[PDB]
Structure formats: structure tokens, C-alpha cells
Amino acid sequence: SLKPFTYPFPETRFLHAGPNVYKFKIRYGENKEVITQELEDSVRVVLGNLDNLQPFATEHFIVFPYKSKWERVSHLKFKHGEIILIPYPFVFTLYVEMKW
Amino acid sequence: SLKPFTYPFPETRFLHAGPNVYKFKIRYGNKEVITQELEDSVRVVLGNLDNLQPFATEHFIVFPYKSKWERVSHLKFKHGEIILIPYPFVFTLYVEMKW
Amino acid sequence: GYISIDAMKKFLGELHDFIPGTSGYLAYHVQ
Amino acid sequence: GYISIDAMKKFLGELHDFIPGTSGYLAYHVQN
């Protein structure tokens, strides 16, 4: 349902989940469908542990999540049609490394 | 200024800086250089208490993390007659081989 | 040793890319 | 890549190991 993740290139993604929009940043240190699925899982884990970020290991990666203040988020308004989406006031940076 | 860190084994260290004491935890996965760069990492974390981010030393990547220091309100630290204030968060440095 | 992803809580609901100009999404800024 | 440690702000002040029972260090805990 999501655009393919950029395996080699770092990227910024805005994600709509429940009533919120989240700002994520992905940084990187063969079956790419599995890779995309586990990266989506990593995002879903970060979303499920918003307040207790810790590094974790997937089948192929170690993910080091970080949270930082989303500066000037008070100066933004996000809408889906007429619905107001609530921006989560923190940006998440996922440092993805290889599980050797 | 600090005693050498235990390079292979994980450890907990209480450090006195300024008027405060900080709780650090080191986890892993010529040792003088390693100890020096780990002290430098600790000093960087202390210099970026509010904006923790990962950084690379000559030999390691350091992933610093902050967590709530539980049961710290029931502790009192003193240096002689001076009252030291414990910083209410524990810093865990995940050290990984840079290559 | 790090915690396995399978031992963690996961948001399982719908998750979409927020792309203004698509799917009715919009974003604004103060002026 | 990752930011170099040499590009970070650094606390340059005095830094000591806190070891109760030495150098005048002391620590206490609440009790019933």
C-alpha cells in the first residue's frame, strides 16, 4: 500500500496513521519485497513504541530509532479532504544497519 | 580523567560532572585509545543532552540513548559537604564496530 | 544483543503515505 | 554515513568517577 522504500538512498516520508501524520527519516549505512516488508514493520514498531524508542534487530537489519523535536510544526496544517490530521510533534529518524 | 572502561564487557558507570552526577551504561555489540574515545563520546553526550544523535569515532559508531532514571528520587548524592544533583535520565551508549 | 523486532509492539492499522495533491491530501503554512 | 565525533559539541570540564566511600563521596537511600 506504500511506495517502495529506497534501499540505497536516504529518504523522508510522511505517514498517515489513525488521526495523525508522522514525519519519518530513513538513513542507511536481494529479495527486496521482504526488505520493504521488514522496513514497513520497523516503521510500525516505531509507531507502536513512540515513547520508548530502542534499537532492535530484524531478520536482516538493526534499526536504531531516534526521536527529535519537529520544529515549526505549529506553523503547519495537514488535511485529508476536509479532515484535519494531527501532526505528531516529533520527527523519527531510523538508522538502518546490516544484521551481520 | 576516568579509569579505563571495560572494552569487552558491559558496564554501568556513575560520573561526576559539574554539580551533577550522571548514570551511564556501556553496551557493546591498544585499549588506551579506546578508553580515550569512549570518554570523548561521554563528553559529547554531555554536550548534547537535549539533542542526542549517533556519531562515529575513529574505531566505533556510538548510538546514545536516554531513558528515565527510575527510583532516582529516593537517592541523595554528596561530595564532602557538597550536594550533587543526579541528572534524572540514564544514558546508554550502544557501541558498534565502525566496520 | 538487540531485541528481536518480533518481540515488539506494532501498529497494525492502516498506514498511508501523506502526499499533498494526492488522495485528497493537503498541507498549509502560516503567512 | 554518521557524523564524526570531532564535529560534535563537547563538554570539556572536569569529569570524575563517582565512587561512594572514596574521595569524600557519599550516597543515601530512603528507608521505612
Numbering used by the authors:
A (entry chain C): 2 to 30, 39 to 109
B (entry chain A): 2 to 30, 40 to 109
C (entry chain D): 175 to 205
D (entry chain B): 175 to 206
Copy text verbatim from the article accompanying this structure deposition.
In mammals, meiotic telomere attachments are achieved by a meiosis-specific complex of MAJIN, TERB1 and TERB2 (herein referred to as the meiotic telomere complex) that repurposes and integrates the functions of two complexes, LINC and shelterin, which otherwise perform distinct critical roles outwith meiosis. MAJIN provides the inner nuclear membrane attachment through a transmembrane helix at its C-terminus, whilst TERB1 is proposed to interact with SUN1 and cohesin components through its N-terminal armadillo repeat domain and C-terminal MYB domain, respectively. MAJIN and TERB1 are physically linked by TERB2, which binds MAJIN through its C-terminus and TERB1 through its N-terminus. Here, we report the crystal structure of the MAJIN–TERB2 complex, revealing a 2:2 heterotetramer in which two TERB2 chains wrap around a core MAJIN globular dimer.
The N-terminal structural core of MAJIN (amino acids 1–112) was recombinantly co-expressed with the C-terminus of TERB2 (amino acids 168–220), yielding a co-purifying equimolar complex. The presence of both proteins was essential for their stability, suggesting that the MAJIN–TERB2 complex is constitutive. We solved the X-ray crystal structure of MAJIN–TERB2 at 2.90 Å resolution through single-wavelength anomalous diffraction of a selenomethionine derivative. Using this as a model for molecular replacement, we proceeded to solve the structure of a truncated complex (MAJIN 1–106 and TERB2 168–207) in an alternative crystal form at 1.85 Å resolution. Both structures are essentially the same and the subsequent discussion is based on the latter higher resolution crystal form. The MAJIN–TERB2 structure demonstrates a 2:2 heterotetrameric assembly, in which two TERB2 chains wrap around the surface of a core globular MAJIN dimer. Size exclusion chromatography small-angle X-ray scattering (SEC-SAXS) revealed scattering curves and ab initio envelopes that closely match the heterotetrameric crystal structure for the truncated construct, with the wider complex demonstrating an elongation consistent with its additional sequence being largely unstructured in solution. The C-terminal end of TERB2 includes five highly conserved basic residues within a seven amino acids stretch (amino acids 214–220); this region is unstructured in the selenomethionine structure (in which they are included) and is essential for DNA-binding by MAJIN–TERB2. The MAJIN–TERB2 structure shows an extensive basic patch on the surface of each protomer, formed of highly conserved amino acids in the grasping β-sheet of MAJIN, suggesting that it may mediate direct DNA-binding through electrostatic interaction with the phosphodiester backbone. Accordingly, analysis of MAJINCore-TERB2C by electrophoretic mobility shift assay (EMSA) confirmed a strong interaction with double-stranded DNA that shows no overt sequence specificity for telomere repeats and is retained for single-stranded DNA.
